[PDB]
Amino acid sequence: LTANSGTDNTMKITVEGDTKLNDLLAYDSTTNTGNMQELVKAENAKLNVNGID
Amino acid sequence: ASSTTEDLKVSTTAGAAAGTYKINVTQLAAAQSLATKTTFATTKEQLGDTSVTS
């Protein structure tokens, strides 16, 4: 599962009504713990235009 | 789909998902080639025995 770009798009997933699936699909990005590993890490674009960051 | 390199070619079938993928290629497939040790004289000189018919 991939989200859009940026660090305001990190995901916190939960499955309600099912338990096996919740054991499969459950992540929390505030604490960086869940049932799903993280292949890519979110980032923001940083640039410098005429000395303004 | 579009790629930033020319060593990697990319095509898309029906059903993909939008996004950006970061490919690293580590190794390339090869194929086994076997060569006879005993080089011959002509491409019409007989190699197997002429006693057998099949």
UniProtKB/Swiss-Prot annotation, chain B:
Q: Give the subcellular location.
A: Secreted; Bacterial flagellum
Q: What does this protein do?
A: Required for the morphogenesis and for the elongation of the flagellar filament by facilitating polymerization of the flagellin monomers at the tip of growing filament. Forms a capping structure, which prevents flagellin subunits (transported through the central channel of the flagellum) from leaking out without polymerization at the distal end.
Subunit details: Homopentamer.
Q: What is this protein called?
A: Flagellar hook-associated protein 2
Instruction: Please state which protein family the record places this protein in.
Output: Belongs to the FliD family.
Per the record, the domain of life is Bacteria
